[PDB]
Structure 1
Amino acid sequence: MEKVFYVTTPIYYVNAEPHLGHAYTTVVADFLARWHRLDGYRTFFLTGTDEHGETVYRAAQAAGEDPKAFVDRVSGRFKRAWDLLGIAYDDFIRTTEERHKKVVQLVLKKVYEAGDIYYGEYEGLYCVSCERFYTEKELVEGLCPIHGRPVERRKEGNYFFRMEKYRPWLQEYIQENPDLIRPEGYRNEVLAMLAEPIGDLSISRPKSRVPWGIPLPWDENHVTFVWFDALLNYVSALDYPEGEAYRTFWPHAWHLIGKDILKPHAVFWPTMLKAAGIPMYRHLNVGGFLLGPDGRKMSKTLGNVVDPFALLEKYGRDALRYYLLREIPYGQDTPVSEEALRTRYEADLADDLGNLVQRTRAMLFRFAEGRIPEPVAGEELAEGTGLAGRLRPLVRELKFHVALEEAMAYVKALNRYINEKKPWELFKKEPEEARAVLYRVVEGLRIASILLTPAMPDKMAELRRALGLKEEVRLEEAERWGLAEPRPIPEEAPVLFPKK
């Protein structure tokens, strides 16, 4: 009950084709959630889709579909992606949901009534012929993209949130809570962002331009624009006001994001929470870019894209997940490639794990009648029971790669052990000792398989089935020696990680 874990991924643009970036962030959240459930934490893992706005509406019109029907359909790509990646989220929040819309308006009203929202007029570029505003980006050589004529500077009104007002509080809060933003380098970048005025935040757009969105409670002619809509998913899914989920999980909120949305999460979101009278989140965990094989930012035209679904299809979900968690120090820009995945797949998995299980099964049939032998003390291998205590802080400090490295180091120790003891040689004069060695290798594997479960839950369950071990496990089970019972192993079993 005291052990509570709450983790969120950003909600993604609903019509985006899911790619490596979405996959990575969601996979890391999944690992964290599965790890905490395994360690007895009452946990809630949230993910979702950002469904309102001008862009999606443009998309729906182009598709000749009703906005609601369009997002109902395209939000399915993310749900399928998560199915493919084996993501066990507890809830999938869609901003079109009434439960979300109610919270957005409720918080808008609170912040408005607290005196933090005003109607301001900030000149913009306007084309009289189109009778519409245009951002600098949409102009063609500073001219209307339609009429090829100049545009005039007109003032447009929008509602703004007094964000600058909360800058001093945010600076102080970060100073007093140094582990709030992690990795540390991102904390420093945020403090640098806060070194100067941050201005106020545009939070709405007239409905005449953006009809697809949540109207402002005090002005139906304006719709909530991005920030107060999307960001609130983190509390709306918890039935925020007085829902039990909110009272229970919000005090432990961990948000995982890509560094691409650092400012909205480290600057905007905190001031919004402060103004709304909502407690600050516990941690903002910032991931880096997954660069292409060439060390450059991933992009279709550079031709350096790595497709997680194609990789997943070829090597399987578990191998991909393991690769992403092991190879990348969370927060640090890192190049990825099929070649690096393949390397990890053939050595760490097929060899250190697969071959060892294959060898162990063959040896159990030859020297132990096809059953796990009678339990015996672990001796040098008993140390494996202390690994969970070492990985707990590594995992919670976002050092997934180090945690996986230590779990795999033990697996390598199991290999070295069996290769040094040579049960097959010991069997002649000392059959009992040969059986003792094999027991230590199977019990060691049971332990390692538990530690690795959050990364490869399916393959680790498969590994346990291959050795006749109980499939369903708990992290604490990896902390005691001698749990593998002397039972029959399946007479046949597939190679855990077949050649590709």
Structure 2
Amino acid sequence: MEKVFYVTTPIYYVNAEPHLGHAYTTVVADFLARWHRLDGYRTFFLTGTDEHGETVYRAAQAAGEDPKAFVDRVSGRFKRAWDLLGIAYDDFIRTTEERHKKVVQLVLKKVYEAGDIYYGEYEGLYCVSCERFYTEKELVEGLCPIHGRPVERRKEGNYFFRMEKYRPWLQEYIQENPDLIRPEGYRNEVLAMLAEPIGDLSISRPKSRVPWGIPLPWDENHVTYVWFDALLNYVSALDYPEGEAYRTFWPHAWHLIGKDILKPHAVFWPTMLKAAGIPMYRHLNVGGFLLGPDGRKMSKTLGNVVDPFALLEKYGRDALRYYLLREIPYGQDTPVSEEALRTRYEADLADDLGNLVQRTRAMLFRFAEGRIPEPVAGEELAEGTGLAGRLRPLVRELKFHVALEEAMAYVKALNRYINEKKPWELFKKEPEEARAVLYRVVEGLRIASILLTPAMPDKMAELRRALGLKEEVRLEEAERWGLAEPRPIPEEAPVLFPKK
């Protein structure tokens, strides 16, 4: 009713093996969602797969499999992948689902009846083998990417959407809403395109060419092609018309995308919503490219490709997520490598966090009889309760690297604290002081673990379990000092982050 959060990731092409780019955007959405769930927000985190089209159709035909049966099996590679990355999405939308088809046809009819749709002719480079149109850039120097054959100018009957008519409105909307497209840099690029005519939008293709897809309500001989299909998922998953979910979440829609699909989300999408009578989204959040270790765009030929799943099996899901959130500023092109991840893992996780936990546990068994000491003021460590409040705005503004840098900064402060106070020496003189010092460390770690939960859900819960703290938490608990209770700690706990 008040605190509402809705985040979406793009709907990914089904016949595409999940890669680093899909992993990053999805992990960022997961973090954003987990964080808000923790801040007491009624939240919805959506993800899904794009399954229609002729490429997908021809791939199914090759394997001698039914189209539906094909996407059904391959869409699962994404579900399995998200399972491995620990993605807690609320819904997984598939464009072949009935609920989606229903909404697409519904928005199509409404827009067609509004007179924004007309039959026309599309012209351009065409590949007879592909049965699809290409643009200059899309052509690998003259010829078709696949088939490597010459394309020829061709025309084809297509239904169009009067998108140009909406350019004036869109231009001004972005001018009136400077926060619409989060990373500022990107907001200036959209405005540049709206300065020139954007033209009309082809929204269909003959079933003769594209037999796999959603038919137009007024012309079953045609199929919805891309746009009015994939884009509507954001609204389809909410049962848009009479759905409670649509009424609750749509008003706070946060779209996460990569810069590659910026025009479709910043220009096309807003005008389709306008013509459909649907309110504009709240924010379009653009992430940059995760460049190879050589600072170049990942690629086979360059052999600079980084596989997240291989890296996940080596260091674990928690390590991977942390590295990507702490090391890559959202919106900026950043190179990634296995070396950068191993360093962060060695320093931040295995040493600063894991060792401190292992160290504190050993010291509780020795100086506190295997139990958390009696609560005491935090002194210079009490300032950590003001982190949640300083992090909230940092997170909302897509500054995840700065947020985590702050949380880990506190963890480093904890290390320095215990290394300075030296509880094993203070015990000889005053046991009460040694215990006091230890309590501040367990309570300092409790708070830290909370702040880091969205980044490493399993590991942070493991940290609390290992210190006898309450596993399930809420961000508000990280704002009050003295919550850790004096209870025994598990006699044996595995090393949080083992040596690799």
TM exceeding 0.5:
yes
- Shift in CA distance, 460/196, structure 1 to aligned 2, threshold 3 Å: same
- Shift in CA distance, 131/391, structure 1 to aligned 2, threshold 3 Å: closer
Q: Secondary structure at the match of 2:171?
A: helix
Shift of 1:451: 0.1
Contact 1:124 1:156 in 2 (8 A): no
**Residue-by-residue CA offset, 1:318-372 (whole Å, 9 max, x unaligned):** 0000000000000000011000000000001111101101110011011000100
Alignment of 1:10-21 (within 5 A): 10-21=10-21
Greater Cα shift, 134-143 or 280-289: 134-143
Q: Secondary structure at the match of 1:321?
A: helix
- Shift in CA distance, 455/196, structure 1 to aligned 2, threshold 3 Å: same
Cα distance in 2 for partners of 1:216, 1:448 equals 53
Contact 2:290 2:335 in 1 (8 A): yes
**Residue-by-residue CA offset, 1:357-401 (whole Å, 9 max, x unaligned):** 111001101100010000001111111111000000000000000
Q: Secondary structure at the match of 2:48?
A: strand
Cα distance in 1 for partners of 2:419, 2:480 equals 24
Contact 2:131 2:209 in 1 (8 A): no
**Residue-by-residue CA offset, 1:24-68 (whole Å, 9 max, x unaligned):** 000000000000001100000000000001111111112211100
- Partner of residue 332, structure 2: 332
Shift of 1:193: 1.3
- Shift in CA distance, 441/203, structure 1 to aligned 2, threshold 3 Å: same
Contact 2:122 2:202 in 1 (8 A): no
- Shift in CA distance, 329/152, structure 1 to aligned 2, threshold 3 Å: closer
Contact 1:8 1:255 in 2 (8 A): yes
Cα distance in 1 for partners of 2:196, 2:300 equals 36
Contact 1:206 1:221 in 2 (8 A): yes
- Shift in CA distance, 362/133, structure 1 to aligned 2, threshold 3 Å: closer
Cα distance in 1 for partners of 2:157, 2:323 equals 49
Cα distance in 2 for partners of 1:148, 1:21 equals 26
Cα distance in 2 for partners of 1:471, 1:314 equals 26
Contact 2:10 2:48 in 1 (8 A): yes
**Residue-by-residue CA offset, 1:439-460 (whole Å, 9 max, x unaligned):** 0000000000000000000000
Contact 1:125 1:133 in 2 (8 A): yes
Cα distance in 2 for partners of 1:403, 1:133 equals 44
Shift of 1:128: 9.8
Q: Which runs of 5+ in 2 are unaligned?
A: none
Shift of 1:309: 0.5
Cα distance in 2 for partners of 1:162, 1:391 equals 43
Q: Secondary structure at the match of 1:125?
A: strand
- Shift in CA distance, 493/302, structure 1 to aligned 2, threshold 3 Å: same
Cα distance in 1 for partners of 2:491, 2:454 equals 27
Cα distance in 2 for partners of 1:295, 1:147 equals 30
Shift of 1:154: 4.8
Contact 2:469 2:485 in 1 (8 A): yes
Shift of 1:194: 1.0
Q: Secondary structure at the match of 1:387?
A: helix
Shift of 1:182: 1.5
Greater Cα shift, 26-35 or 139-148: 139-148
Q: Secondary structure at the match of 1:182?
A: coil
Cα distance in 2 for partners of 1:132, 1:282 equals 34
- Partner of residue 266, structure 1: 266
- Shift in CA distance, 492/380, structure 1 to aligned 2, threshold 3 Å: same
Contact 1:411 1:445 in 2 (8 A): yes
Q: Secondary structure at the match of 1:93?
A: strand
- Indicate yes or no: 2:343 matched with 1:357: no
**Residue-by-residue CA offset, 1:263-285 (whole Å, 9 max, x unaligned):** 00001000000010000000000
Cα distance in 1 for partners of 2:132, 2:32 equals 46
Greater Cα shift, 149-158 or 63-72: 149-158
Cα distance in 1 for partners of 2:474, 2:71 equals 38
Contact 1:7 1:29 in 2 (8 A): yes
Segments of 4+ moved more than 6 angstroms? 126-152
- Indicate yes or no: 2:10 matched with 1:5: no
**Residue-by-residue CA offset, 1:68-104 (whole Å, 9 max, x unaligned):** 0000000010000000000000000000000000000
- Shift in CA distance, 381/64, structure 1 to aligned 2, threshold 3 Å: same
Q: How many residues align?
A: 500
Q: Secondary structure at the match of 1:449?
A: helix
Q: Secondary structure at the match of 2:126?
A: strand
**Residue-by-residue CA offset, 1:186-205 (whole Å, 9 max, x unaligned):** 00011111111111111000
Q: TM-score, normalised by structure 1?
A: 0.96
Cα distance in 2 for partners of 1:107, 1:371 equals 61
- Indicate yes or no: 2:228 matched with 1:228: yes
Q: TM-score, normalised by structure 2?
A: 0.96
Q: Secondary structure at the match of 1:5?
A: strand
% identical equivalent positions: 100
- Shift in CA distance, 373/289, structure 1 to aligned 2, threshold 3 Å: same
**Residue-by-residue CA offset, 1:243-288 (whole Å, 9 max, x unaligned):** 0000000000001011110000001000000010000000000000
Shift of 1:155: 3.2
Cα distance in 1 for partners of 2:45, 2:357 equals 33
- Shift in CA distance, 328/96, structure 1 to aligned 2, threshold 3 Å: same
Cα distance in 1 for partners of 2:315, 2:499 equals 9
Contact 1:213 1:225 in 2 (8 A): yes
Shift of 1:146: 12
Contact 2:251 2:282 in 1 (8 A): yes
Shift of 1:495: 1.0
**Residue-by-residue CA offset, 1:383-442 (whole Å, 9 max, x unaligned):** 111100000000000000000000000001101111111111110111001100000000
Contact 1:52 1:95 in 2 (8 A): yes
Greater Cα shift, 221-230 or 114-123: 114-123
- Shift in CA distance, 261/143, structure 1 to aligned 2, threshold 3 Å: closer
Q: Secondary structure at the match of 1:55?
A: helix
- Shift in CA distance, 497/180, structure 1 to aligned 2, threshold 3 Å: same
- Shift in CA distance, 424/128, structure 1 to aligned 2, threshold 3 Å: closer
Shift of 1:147: 12
Q: CA RMSD in A?
A: 2.2
Cα distance in 2 for partners of 1:366, 1:52 equals 63
- Shift in CA distance, 107/468, structure 1 to aligned 2, threshold 3 Å: same
Shift of 1:483: 0.5
Contact 2:4 2:43 in 1 (8 A): yes
Greater Cα shift, 131-140 or 384-393: 131-140
- Shift in CA distance, 198/417, structure 1 to aligned 2, threshold 3 Å: same
- Shift in CA distance, 153/23, structure 1 to aligned 2, threshold 3 Å: closer
**Residue-by-residue CA offset, 1:155-203 (whole Å, 9 max, x unaligned):** 3210011111111111110011101101110000111111111111110
Cα distance in 1 for partners of 2:456, 2:126 equals 54
**Residue-by-residue CA offset, 1:457-487 (whole Å, 9 max, x unaligned):** 0000010011000101000000101000000
- Shift in CA distance, 428/142, structure 1 to aligned 2, threshold 3 Å: closer
Shift of 1:300: 1.5
Shift of 1:123: 3.1
Cα distance in 1 for partners of 2:129, 2:469 equals 74
- Shift in CA distance, 432/64, structure 1 to aligned 2, threshold 3 Å: same
Cα distance in 2 for partners of 1:464, 1:144 equals 56
Cα distance in 2 for partners of 1:413, 1:215 equals 61
Q: Secondary structure at the match of 1:495?
A: coil
Cα distance in 2 for partners of 1:41, 1:396 equals 13
Cα distance in 2 for partners of 1:63, 1:188 equals 45
- Shift in CA distance, 68/444, structure 1 to aligned 2, threshold 3 Å: same
